[PDB]
Ligand binder design. Structure first.
Ligand SMILES: [Ca+2]
Length: 279
């Protein structure tokens, strides 16, 4: 399949080189997989999700997204226009309030919820979670991310936007989940992106157009935008039978565009997520 005039990030993820604007992907499109977005929730009624999004959990007075952030991420994973996996099922877990904040304890409870809740969902092709959130190092938070992963969910988490070493951040510093840095459309590291030996991969994170609340769209930036590219790419590859939750991050790093990014600090990976689709 070919989506012309795609958002740049989508075109990039299916290209060996920057500067193109068509997104190419197998038409299976992540059908039969599931992605959890653990964030400020999802405006499920957005036309762009076409019935494939649902809220399954909130820790606050409402499950609606009063912020927009989680809706944006969700649209990058799986909306028809702005998403990588255009046919995946989307599950929203609201651990952050409408100011985009959440206590560590709620975030942890949210991760354990998904690790049980995937047993209540239909996802023959596999299960992914996109965690675009971040805070100072906590072994409790890391540990929660490690359980989510070990239960059989491909876990992808934002490196963080501090332009610093991600070792000091959770769940970014957890070794067993996929930590995701942000790149821009000229193949440079995003200026806010964290870096470090703990990163596994880079996705598109600067000027990323996707869904927003009130049924609209906007462009915004962050490792939180890059993360759903990788989360959607895993779901897509899993429905293709190419990989599993347990080895997805590894597979994505093996098949990445290598050595193509600029401003990558010595000792951080120079890997850019890539779907290897032969159209
Ligand atoms: Ca990691």
């Amino acid at each position: 399949a070919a989506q012309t005039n795609a958002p740049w990030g989508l075109a990039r993820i299916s290209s060996t080189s920057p500067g193109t604007s068509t997104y190419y992907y197998d038409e299976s499109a992540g059908q039969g997989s599931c992605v959890y977005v653990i964030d400020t929730g999802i405006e499920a009624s957005h036309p762009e999700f076409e019935g494939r999004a649902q809220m399954v959990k909130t820790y606050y007075y409402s499950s609606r997204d009063g912020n927009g952030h989680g809706t944006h991420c969700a649209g990058t994973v799986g909306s028809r226009t702005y998403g990588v996996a255009k046919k995946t099922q989307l599950f929203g877990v609201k651990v952050l309030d409408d100011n985009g904040s959440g206590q560590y304890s709620t975030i942890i409870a949210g991760m354990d919820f998904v690790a049980s809740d995937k047993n209540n969902r239909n996802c023959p092709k596999g299960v992914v979670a996109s965690l675009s959130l971040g805070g100072g190092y906590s072994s409790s938070v890391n540990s929660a991310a490690a359980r989510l992963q070990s239960s059989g969910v491909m876990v992808a988490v934002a490196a963080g936007n501090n332009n610093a070493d991600a070792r000091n951040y959770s769940p970014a510093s957890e070794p067993s989940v996929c930590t995701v840095g942000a790149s821009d459309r000229y193949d440079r590291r995003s200026s806010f992106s964290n870096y470090g030996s703990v990163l596994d991969i880079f996705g598109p994170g600067t000027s990323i157009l996707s869904t927003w609340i009130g049924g609209s769209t906007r462009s915004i930036s962050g490792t939180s935008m890059a993360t759903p590219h990788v989360a959607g790419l895993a779901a897509y590859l899993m429905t293709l039978g190419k990989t599993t939750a347990a080895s997805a991050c590894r597979y994505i790093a093996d098949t990445a565009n290598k050595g193509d990014l600029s401003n990558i600090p010595f000792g951080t990976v120079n890997l850019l997520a890539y779907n290897n689709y032969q159209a």
